[PDB]
Amino acid sequence: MSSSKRIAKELSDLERDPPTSSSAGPVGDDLYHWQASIMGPADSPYAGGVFFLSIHFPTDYPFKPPKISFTTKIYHPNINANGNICLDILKDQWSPALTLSKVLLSISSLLTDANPDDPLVPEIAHIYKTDRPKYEATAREWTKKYAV
Amino acid sequence: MQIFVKTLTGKTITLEVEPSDTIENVKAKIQDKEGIPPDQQRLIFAGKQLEDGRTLSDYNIQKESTLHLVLRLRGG
Amino acid sequence: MQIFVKTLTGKTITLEVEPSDTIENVKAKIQDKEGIPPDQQRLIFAGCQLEDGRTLSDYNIQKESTLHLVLRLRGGD
Amino acid sequence: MQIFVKTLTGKTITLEVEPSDTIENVKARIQDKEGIPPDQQRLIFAGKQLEDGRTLSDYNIQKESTLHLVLRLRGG
Amino acid sequence: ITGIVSNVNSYTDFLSQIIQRAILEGTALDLLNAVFPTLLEYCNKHVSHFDLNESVIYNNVLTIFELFVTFKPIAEIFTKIDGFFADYSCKPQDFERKTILGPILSLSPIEAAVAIRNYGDNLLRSKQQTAMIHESLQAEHKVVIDRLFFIVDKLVRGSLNSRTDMISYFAHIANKNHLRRADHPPFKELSSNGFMSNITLLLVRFSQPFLDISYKKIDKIDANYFNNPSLFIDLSGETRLNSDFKEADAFYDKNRSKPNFISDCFFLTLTYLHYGLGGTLSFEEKMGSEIKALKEEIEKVKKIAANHDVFARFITAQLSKMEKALKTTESLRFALQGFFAHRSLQLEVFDFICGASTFLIRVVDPEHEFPFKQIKLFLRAHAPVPFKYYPEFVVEGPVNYSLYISKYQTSPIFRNPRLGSFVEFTTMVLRCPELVSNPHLKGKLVQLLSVGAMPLTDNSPGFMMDIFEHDELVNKNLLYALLDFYVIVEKQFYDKFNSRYSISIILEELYYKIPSYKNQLIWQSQNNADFFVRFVARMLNDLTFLLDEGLSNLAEVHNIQNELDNDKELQTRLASASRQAKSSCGLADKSMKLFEIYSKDIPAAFVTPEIVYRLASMLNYNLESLVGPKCGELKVKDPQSYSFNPKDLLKALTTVYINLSEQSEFISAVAKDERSFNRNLFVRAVDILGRKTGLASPEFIEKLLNFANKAEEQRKADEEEDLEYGDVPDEFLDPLMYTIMKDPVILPASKMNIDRSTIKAHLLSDSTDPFNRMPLKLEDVTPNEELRQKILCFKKQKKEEA
């Protein structure tokens, strides 16, 4: 009734139209734990990096935004060591009309622009507001560490 | 330019604009009545964001088009 | 308004605040009734550590809210 | 004439006064040596809250009596 | 002077007339200014530590005051001694050394050097060997206490000036020492516990006349004590119960009235309750961890060889000062317990509390006749006035003392018939939320009631169960309060479940032993229905992820542990992963056990349409974690530590199905929960219960296998409906559910079609439209009868081939 056919429909349309620099799907035959996979934008030091996502839908998913975290360790201010994502539409800006593909559009968009005024890490936000040569270096540095 | 913008509880206000304004120049005539920060300038126009750092000449607001000002609760 | 601060020893103090007051201004009150300098006083609200430059005009308006007091100490091993 | 004023913290101060003095002028003398603003100050004699425009002879205050100052409760 | 102290029993007649010499001459205060400072001189410098060990010496000094304090013309003027009161700029640790009253109040067995004298000679004496150390000192302690009370009473009854002075003397001590309640107080800067505990006892013994068990002298204490500003207790910064500063400062201004020693001495006692013993009890409780931290520091250093001559003597002497420091703390933890176990002192303290509890209910009483007639039981504006303006240490003080002292088997709370006055107060707080708006204060009240309602080791009813039965105030309204207070404590947030762990114990015990509450229950299910469903929906909703958090942290315990199977902040988080999983593995059992007992007797409550979809989801997903690989591969070391006993938890979980098994709706619900339904799940749970021998009956299994078979024939018929409806027109699909709308209603804002039930769950979360962010209410809708006629038509079209 409540949950399953909503999830399977959004799965089906990504199987119809796959995202270009992204890809997502379930972890095996467990419908309520998926796996996403993205590539970084070319106008970023996040380029060249591939990132995997730990995904957990809740039991009231079409009416609660999901719990989704990163797997790869990244030099990013809006991402902690847990891979928690300080993103707006993952919270009270949620609408049930939102598709996970459109959610994944917002994720690389945060990797594109990097809104610093929600400092999930304090130190990286200070580096980004002071020295772009320090920030853009270490992101490609930890890309070669982790996101290869 | 007479354009429209509406709040959560039903309140809407009236103000002027220009075709060569910016989205914070929309906001520049938003804190002149309420006194709200331009970091909280939040526009929900048909399911997508209207970004603040852009100009007005990209976001297809026509004569007396209605915008949607909700205050932000950003952070974490 | 007034808000709550809960320490990790199961102690609860209250503190009347103004939304104009800074996080530093909050730390200076809790300084006097806990004997702790504000450098050691780390705060958590909704998981996110607050910023010294910020105020209570910045994080999630409601009265009767409750902070947590994570005690970072100066010294380790 | 001199009088004695006692605090909640127990500070004991002397004060040269006159029986016809207004109480805010007395509180000005408290602010004169201790800087505490008069709207904050609140004085008790004989277990009674006082009034600013009155005099000492209105409240029958004999010399070298004991006054009690309550700092009215400041906020956060 | 010195030989006067040494031979005090010989000079006691010779110096008696010389005291009497100056009484008739009126020159009495002159030599009084000469004796007691020189007496303060002789105790401070000629003896390095005037203490309780020098059994010759302090027994001399007590009699010296007894030589004076009998004389009525002297005790009326005793307060005029040089150095009687303290300095305005006095350090709070320096009361008890520069005061005439200073040292003799500090005679107490809980001093460090006395604990060095009487514990450090052997650290592992037995539990029987422990007790004889105490009563050697505890009976000697009563000699100290009772002789001081003889002194201070004649100071009070000496004059009208002098009883004012002792109130002034105590107020300057308490206000310098609000930091005793801090988490890590400056103990070298505050007053000692021996100085604070002794004075705490004396004000209680002043209360004994007008705290009699007849309770007719209760109107001697003014309930109007706080409307007027306090001249003695510094209320500045002291948090009021249900008022902020600005209303209270107006409430001093409004209503603009004499002081009275009766009311003065009473509220001062609660200050020395809270800021005295209340920090002292928190001081003892940390020494379980203060010793535990200290042993690991020394254990690291003892593996180090010492060669480098500058650094070898350092590391050698580094341990030796910590040796005495370990000798310090281990002496003190053994010292404070017997002080807290000396029940003859501990009775008077708890006698003061319930008597003061009788006072507080009289205040809440609008007729103020509580001690005779029983009380009849937004929140700030409707609050009673006097009460809402009282401070919070009148409640926090007693309940800290009550939560702490119940760890002792020698509990003075236990077998006290006067106890029930407190629980009348405690019920009344949790009944009307207008009294205290603070929930964290109310958490320690409801944490206390579980401690009073724990079954003992011999499974006897707890020491409030007789009080829970025989108190006509409590039995009317304790049930409605606890069910209400379970809801509110919603208001990450990892303490909101600590209070619900305390409620669910009390809900379980009252359902077992008191049948009237069970009768009151059921009637609340049948005739207070909209209230009780919110309690069920709340307790259901938490349990959906309590088991998930227990799976989350217990692996993360291993992940910290296997990291040390190769810094201390992970070990600091290892305790954080411990208790939060302990609360996860704990509360989930306590929640599940309440479903077992309620479904047994009120199953018709759980079969409402608003719960039956929710409940079958929660049961099935919790089931698969237990029987599946997740809890099975999670091999926890000593599972009785976390009480992670899913084998025990399963028996409850299966019984919930069996209790609900006579309801076709619950049968229809579980077959429609395809998120976690399978026939094989229960079949797995058979042989799991087939492992725990005798834990489940074969008929218990047979009823369960009857349930799963009826569930399985249902869902096959359910998908039989699904196979006859394949390809489907897109317009007949609910654009947030992607299923066929039963009741298609039209959105007014975005003009879209939606099911009634779909937007209802949206509007139960937010009153905004999901498609164009417009405001939206349930009354705004418009039902589309026209589209549902085509839904009626098209469903009959596939019936034409079905």
Curated annotation (Swiss-Prot), chain A:
Q: In which pathway does it act?
A: Protein modification; protein ubiquitination
The knockout outcome noted for this protein's gene is: Defective activation of the ribosome quality control (RQC) pathway.
What top-level branch of life does the organism fall under?
A: Eukaryota
Query: Glycyl lysine isopeptide (Lys-Gly) (interchain with G-Cter in ubiquitin) cross-link position in this chain?
Result: 91
Which InterPro entries does its entry note? UBQ-conjugat_E2_core (IPR000608), UBQ-conjugating_AS (IPR023313), UBQ-conjugating_enzyme/RWD (IPR016135)
GO cellular component terms, semicolon-separated: cytoplasm; nucleus
> Which CDD domains does UniProt cross-reference here?
UBCc_UBE2D
Q: Where is the composition biased (Basic and acidic residues)?
A: 7-18
Carrying Phosphoserine, the residues are: 12
Q: Which residue ranges are recorded for the region named Disordered?
A: 1-22
Q: Please state what class of enzyme this protein is.
A: transferase
For this UniProt record, give its keywords in alphabetical order, as a comma-separated list: ATP-binding, Isopeptide bond, Nucleotide-binding, Phosphoprotein, Stress response, Transferase, Ubl conjugation, Ubl conjugation pathway
Domain named UBC core is located at: 2-148
Induction cue: By heat shock and cadmium.
GO biological process terms, semicolon-separated: cellular response to heat; cytoplasm protein quality control by the ubiquitin-proteasome system; mitochondria-associated ubiquitin-dependent protein catabolic process; protein polyubiquitination; rescue of stalled ribosome; ribosome-associated ubiquitin-dependent protein catabolic process; ubiquitin-dependent protein catabolic process; ubiquitin-dependent protein catabolic process via the multivesicular body sorting pathway
Which Pfam families does its entry note?
UQ_con (PF00179)
What GO molecular function annotation could you give as one example from this UniProt entry?
ubiquitin conjugating enzyme activity
Active-site residues, as the UniProt record annotates them: 86 (glycyl thioester intermediate)
**Function statement:** E2 ubiquitin-conjugating enzyme that catalyzes the covalent attachment of ubiquitin to other proteins. Mediates the selective degradation of short-lived and abnormal proteins. Mediates ubiquitination of PEX5.
Q: Quaternary state and partners of this protein?
A: Interacts with TUL1.
Query: What PANTHER family has UniProt attached to this entry?
Result: UBIQUITIN-CONJUGATING ENZYME E2 (PTHR24068)
UniProtKB/Swiss-Prot annotation, chain B:
Residue numbers bearing the Phosphoserine modification: 65
Q: Where is this site: Interacts with activating enzyme?
A: 54, 72
Q: Which residues carry this modification: ADP-ribosylglycine?
A: 76
Record location of the Glycyl lysine isopeptide (Gly-Lys) (interchain with K-? in acceptor proteins) cross-link: 76
> Annotated cross-link Glycyl lysine isopeptide (Lys-Gly) (interchain with G-Cter in ubiquitin) - which positions?
6, 11, 27, 29, 33, 48, 63
Variant or mutagenesis effect after changing residue 76 to A: Loss of ADP-ribosylation
On modification after translation, the UniProt record reads: Phosphorylated at Ser-65 by PINK1 during mitophagy. Phosphorylated ubiquitin specifically binds and activates parkin (PRKN), triggering mitophagy. Phosphorylation does not affect E1-mediated E2 charging of ubiquitin but affects discharging of E2 enzymes to form polyubiquitin chains. It also affects deubiquitination by deubiquitinase enzymes such as USP30. Mono-ADP-ribosylated at the C-terminus by PARP9, a component of the PPAR9-DTX3L complex. ADP-ribosylation requires processing by E1 and E2 enzymes and prevents ubiquitin conjugation to substrates such as histones.
The Ubiquitin-like domain is annotated at: 1-76
Residue numbers of (Microbial infection) ADP-ribosylthreonine PTMs: 66
Question: Where does the entry annotate site (Essential for function)?
Answer: 68
Q: What is the effect of changing residue 72 to K?
A: No effect on ADP-ribosylation
Q: Where in the cell is it found?
A: Cytoplasm; Nucleus
Its function, per the record, reads: Exists either covalently attached to another protein, or free (unanchored). When covalently bound, it is conjugated to target proteins via an isopeptide bond either as a monomer (monoubiquitin), a polymer linked via different Lys residues of the ubiquitin (polyubiquitin chains) or a linear polymer linked via the initiator Met of the ubiquitin (linear polyubiquitin chains).
Question: Under which name does UniProt file this protein?
Answer: Ubiquitin
Q: Which organism is it from?
A: Homo sapiens
Q: What gene is this protein a product of?
A: RPS27A
Complete protein: which residues are present?
A: 1 to 76 of 156
Curated annotation (Swiss-Prot), chain D:
Domain of life here? Eukaryota
Outcome reported for the amino acid change (mutating residue 72 to A):
Impairs ubiquitination by CRL2(KLHDC3) E3 ligase complex. Impairs ubiquitination by CRL2(KLHDC3) E3 ligase complex
Q: What is the effect of changing residue 75 to R/Q?
A: No effect on ubiquitination by CRL2(KLHDC3) E3 ligase complex. Impairs ubiquitination by CRL2(KLHDC10) E3 ligase complex
Q: What is the effect of changing residue 65 to E?
A: Phosphomimetic mutant that binds and activates PRKN
Query: For the modification ADP-ribosylglycine, which residues carry it?
Result: 76
Q: Which residues carry this modification: Phosphoserine?
A: 65
What does changing residue 74 to G do? No effect on ADP-ribosylation
Q: Topology in the membrane?
A: Peripheral membrane protein
* Covalent cross-link site, Glycyl lysine isopeptide (Lys-Gly) (interchain with G-Cter in ubiquitin): 6, 11, 27, 29, 33, 48, 63
| Result when mutating residue 48 to R | No effect on HLTF-mediated polyubiquitination of PCNA. Impairs ubiquitination by CRL2(KLHDC3) E3 ligase complex
Modified after translation how?
Phosphorylated at Ser-65 by PINK1 during mitophagy. Phosphorylated ubiquitin specifically binds and activates parkin (PRKN), triggering mitophagy. Phosphorylation does not affect E1-mediated E2 charging of ubiquitin but affects discharging of E2 enzymes to form polyubiquitin chains. It also affects deubiquitination by deubiquitinase enzymes such as USP30. Mono-ADP-ribosylated at the C-terminus by PARP9, a component of the PPAR9-DTX3L complex. ADP-ribosylation requires processing by E1 and E2 enzymes and prevents ubiquitin conjugation to substrates such as histones.
Chain positions of site Interacts with activating enzyme: 54, 72
Recorded consequence of changing residue 7 to D: Impairs ubiquitination by CRL2(KLHDC3) E3 ligase complex
Compartments, as annotated in UniProt: Cytoplasm; Nucleus; Mitochondrion outer membrane
Effect ascribed to mutating residue 72 to G: No effect on ADP-ribosylation
Q: Which residues carry this modification: (Microbial infection) ADP-ribosylthreonine?
A: 66
The annotated site for Essential for function falls at 68
Report residues of the Glycyl lysine isopeptide (Gly-Lys) (interchain with K-? in acceptor proteins) crosslink. Answer: 76
Q: Where is the Ubiquitin-like domain?
A: 1-76
Give the protein's recorded name. Answer: Ubiquitin
What gene name is listed for this protein? UBC
Positions spanned in the full protein = 1 to 76 of 685
Curated annotation (Swiss-Prot), chain E:
Q: Which reaction does it catalyse?
A: S-ubiquitinyl-[E2 ubiquitin-conjugating enzyme]-L-cysteine + [acceptor protein]-L-lysine = [E2 ubiquitin-conjugating enzyme]-L-cysteine + N(6)-ubiquitinyl-[acceptor protein]-L-lysine
Instruction: State the PROSITE patterns in the record.
Output: U_BOX (PS51698)
Where's it mainly located? cytoplasm
Q: Which UniProt keywords apply?
A: Cytoplasm, Nucleus, Transferase, Ubl conjugation pathway
Q: List the disulfide bonds.
A: none
- Which GO molecular function annotations are given, in alphabetical order? ubiquitin-ubiquitin ligase activity
GO CC, one annotated term: nucleus
Know anything about its domains from the record?
Answer: The U-box domain is required for the ubiquitin protein ligase activity.
Describe its assembly.
Answer: Interacts with CDC48. Interacts with the ubiquitin-like domain of RAD23 and DSK2. Interacts with PEX29.
- Descriptive protein name: E4 ubiquitin-protein ligase UFD2
- Origin species, per record, is Saccharomyces cerevisiae (strain ATCC 204508 / S288c) (Baker's yeast)
